[PDB]
Design an enzyme around this catalytic site. Structure first.
Site, mmCIF file in Angstrom:
data_model
loop_
_atom_site.group_PDB
_atom_site.id
_atom_site.type_symbol
_atom_site.label_atom_id
_atom_site.label_comp_id
_atom_site.label_asym_id
_atom_site.label_seq_id
_atom_site.Cartn_x
_atom_site.Cartn_y
_atom_site.Cartn_z
ATOM 1 N N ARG A 75 10.909 4.546 6.547
ATOM 2 C CA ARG A 75 10.230 4.589 5.266
ATOM 3 C C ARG A 75 8.965 5.441 5.361
ATOM 4 N NH1 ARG A 75 6.243 0.559 2.374
ATOM 5 N NH2 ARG A 75 6.144 1.596 0.315
ATOM 6 N N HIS A 119 2.585 6.798 -2.752
ATOM 7 C CA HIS A 119 1.822 5.865 -1.922
ATOM 8 C C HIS A 119 0.367 6.280 -1.963
ATOM 9 C CE1 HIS A 119 2.319 2.835 1.576
ATOM 10 N NE2 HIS A 119 1.015 2.954 1.393
ATOM 11 N N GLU A 164 2.846 -0.695 -4.165
ATOM 12 C CA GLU A 164 1.756 -1.612 -4.501
ATOM 13 C C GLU A 164 0.927 -1.211 -5.733
ATOM 14 O OE1 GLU A 164 -0.387 -2.307 -0.878
ATOM 15 O OE2 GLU A 164 1.275 -3.465 0.019
ATOM 16 N N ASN A 287 6.160 -6.321 0.344
ATOM 17 C CA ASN A 287 5.279 -6.218 1.489
ATOM 18 C C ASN A 287 4.624 -7.595 1.685
ATOM 19 O OD1 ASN A 287 5.900 -3.441 1.391
ATOM 20 N ND2 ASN A 287 3.876 -2.823 0.683
ATOM 21 N N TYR A 289 1.809 -9.792 4.530
ATOM 22 C CA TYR A 289 0.950 -9.745 5.715
ATOM 23 C C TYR A 289 0.242 -11.057 5.995
ATOM 24 C CZ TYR A 289 1.305 -4.626 5.659
ATOM 25 O OH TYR A 289 1.734 -3.337 5.710
ATOM 26 N N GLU A 343 7.202 -3.688 4.190
ATOM 27 C CA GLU A 343 6.079 -3.647 5.125
ATOM 28 C C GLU A 343 5.816 -5.057 5.630
ATOM 29 O OE1 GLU A 343 2.376 -1.956 3.727
ATOM 30 O OE2 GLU A 343 3.338 -0.288 2.705
HETATM 31 C C1 LIG Z 1 -2.571 -5.556 0.006
HETATM 32 O O1 LIG Z 1 -1.258 -5.595 0.613
HETATM 33 C C2 LIG Z 1 -1.152 -5.535 2.043
HETATM 34 O O2 LIG Z 1 -2.182 -6.276 2.712
HETATM 35 C C3 LIG Z 1 -1.045 -4.121 2.489
HETATM 36 C C4 LIG Z 1 -1.261 -3.815 3.820
HETATM 37 N N1 LIG Z 1 -1.038 -2.490 3.921
HETATM 38 C C5 LIG Z 1 -0.705 -1.996 2.703
HETATM 39 N N2 LIG Z 1 -0.695 -3.011 1.817
HETATM 40 C C6 LIG Z 1 -0.436 -0.573 2.370
HETATM 41 O O3 LIG Z 1 0.886 -0.403 1.881
HETATM 42 C C7 LIG Z 1 -0.565 0.315 3.608
HETATM 43 O O4 LIG Z 1 -0.811 1.647 3.151
HETATM 44 C C8 LIG Z 1 -1.635 -0.235 4.569
HETATM 45 O O5 LIG Z 1 -1.941 0.679 5.619
HETATM 46 C C9 LIG Z 1 -1.167 -1.606 5.117
HETATM 47 C C10 LIG Z 1 -2.136 -2.196 6.106
HETATM 48 O O6 LIG Z 1 -3.340 -2.628 5.475
#
Ligand SMILES: CO[C@H](O)c1c[n+]2c([nH]1)[C@H](O)[C@@H](O)[C@H](O)[C@H]2CO
Length: 437
Positions: A75, A119, A164, A287, A289, A343
């Protein structure tokens, strides 16, 4: 052992501005991340995407890393201003060549491309015309997308309109922490709306141009839990997670608690656009985290409560059951035909030991735990077709600059040397095995 379905797509994920460098090479227009990061005070240490991972020159090496790891999907995103330097009108053949080489190389090596159209690196020329604040962006985005479909849709069959859009709108136009760096709640919600309209116009063009592919859209999600014995949690889910966009896409209106908080910030006749917004999509990318403890707070009437839990170098609480939760909830709420985890990953303070390796057992533990929770959701019927590690490489982490390392491959920025981390080797074994053991 935890084995995944046959043909399940194991991937890694990047974004153009974060890895490429050379933002002005070969006729590219400036993007809003170029101008934002070149503005003092916006990014930690004055870091910019000028060099980044030099992937613009080292792209073949990085794909060879993907190949050698046996990872099955890649991706990546396309820089809009490399393709259309002024955002609309002129098309830059050298921009197209760059991605054409990446695409053909991937296919030749049996790696499946997943292309993120946007992006975050909007052409600066279009920001001058309002960017996401301007209704005309639905046309600009559709015209850009049409170019990508015409040039690459013979080969790329998996497309993502937006990464996002909540972050694009809210972080970019309310918090002011991301490009274009604004703080206006009315602008921010007009960006939300326009992102939806641009997405739907792009999906509509895709159906006219690429009769044999699939298209979707990617959302950020947190696992919110209430500090006690809960409506604030309902709000955070509807506002911060996929419902902000999926309620319009599937049900033709914003979610109820979003309308309570924000109705006055949305255009007056926004429902006029809802039927076009319901353009059918092929998959949802989620995504994930982090988890957050949430409470009502009178002083958007929500505050986060710190928890004594393991955290990453971002200070994000490690909550693996969140990925199971969000996968379950998306099926239950909207039942999309396919889902991908587009992600998942973690930032840790990575060091190269004197043995020449990067012993990121913290990252291995993070990924393993989340992969297991994703397996569980598959067992309980979630149509999860793939999983993407953020990121292949340590890269430019937006307003954190180079200070946060999310890669399964370490990048030494003084030499541009790539060092595969323990987590990268570990993940390669998972992909080879099609799961955990
Ligand atoms: C707010 O959503 C996630 O925490 C998120 C985390 N991340 C993301 N979104 C983005 O898609 C990436 O470009 C970032 O590099 C990556 C790491 O921070």
């Amino acid at each position: 052992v935890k084995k995944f379905p046959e043909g399940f797509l194991w991937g890694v994920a990047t974004a153009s501005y974060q890895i490429e460098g050379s933002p002005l090479a070969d006729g590219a227009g400036m993007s809003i991340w170029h101008t934002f990061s070149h503005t003092p005070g916006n990014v930690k240490n004055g870091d910019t995407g000028d060099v980044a991972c030099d992937h613009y020159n080292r792209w073949k090496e990085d794909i060879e890393i993907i190949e050698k790891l046996g990872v099955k999907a890649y991706r990546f995103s396309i820089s809009w201003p490399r393709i259309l330097p002024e955002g609309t009108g002129r098309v830059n053949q050298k921009g197209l060549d760059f991605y054409n080489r990446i695409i053909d190389t991937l296919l030749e090596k049996g790696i499946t491309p997943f292309v993120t159209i946007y992006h975050w690196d909007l052409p600066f020329a279009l920001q001058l015309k309002g960017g996401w604040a301007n209704r005309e962006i639905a046309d600009w985005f559709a015209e850009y997308s049409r170019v990508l479909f015409e040039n690459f849709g013979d080969r790329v069959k998996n497309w993502i309109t937006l990464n996002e859009p909540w972050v694009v709108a809210i972080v970019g136009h309310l918090y002011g922490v991301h490009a274009p760096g604004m703080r206006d709640i009315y602008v921010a919600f007009r960006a939300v709306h326009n992102l939806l309209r641009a997405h739907a116009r792009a999906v509509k063009v895709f159906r006219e141009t690429v009769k044999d592919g699939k298209i979707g859209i990617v959302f950020n999600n947190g696992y919110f839990e209430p500090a006690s014995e809960i409506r604030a949690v309902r709000f955070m889910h509807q506002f911060n997670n996929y419902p902000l966009f999926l309620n319009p896409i599937y049900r033709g209106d914003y979610p109820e608690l979003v309308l309570e908080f924000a109705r006055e910030y949305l255009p007056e006749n926004y429902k006029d656009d809802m039927s076009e917004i319901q353009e059918k999509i092929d998959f949802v990318g989620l995504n994930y985290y982090s988890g957050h403890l949430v409470k009502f707070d009178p002083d958007a009437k929500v505050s986060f409560v710190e928890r004594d839990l393991p955290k990453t170098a971002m200070g994000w609480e490690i909550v693996p059951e969140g990925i199971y939760w969000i996968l379950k909830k998306v099926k239950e709420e909207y039942n999309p035909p396919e889902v991908y985890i587009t992600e998942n990953g973690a930032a840790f303070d990575d060091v190269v030991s004197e043995d020449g390796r990067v012993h990121d057992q913290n990252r291995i533990d993070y990924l393993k735990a989340h992969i297991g929770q994703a397996w569980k959701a598959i067992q309980e019927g979630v149509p999860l077709k793939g999983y993407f590690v953020w990121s292949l490489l340590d890269n430019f982490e937006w307003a954190e600059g180079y200070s946060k390392r999310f890669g399964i491959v370490y990048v030494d920025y003084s030499t541009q040397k790539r060092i595969v981390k323990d987590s990268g080797y570990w993940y390669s074994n998972v992909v080879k095995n099609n799961g955990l053991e």
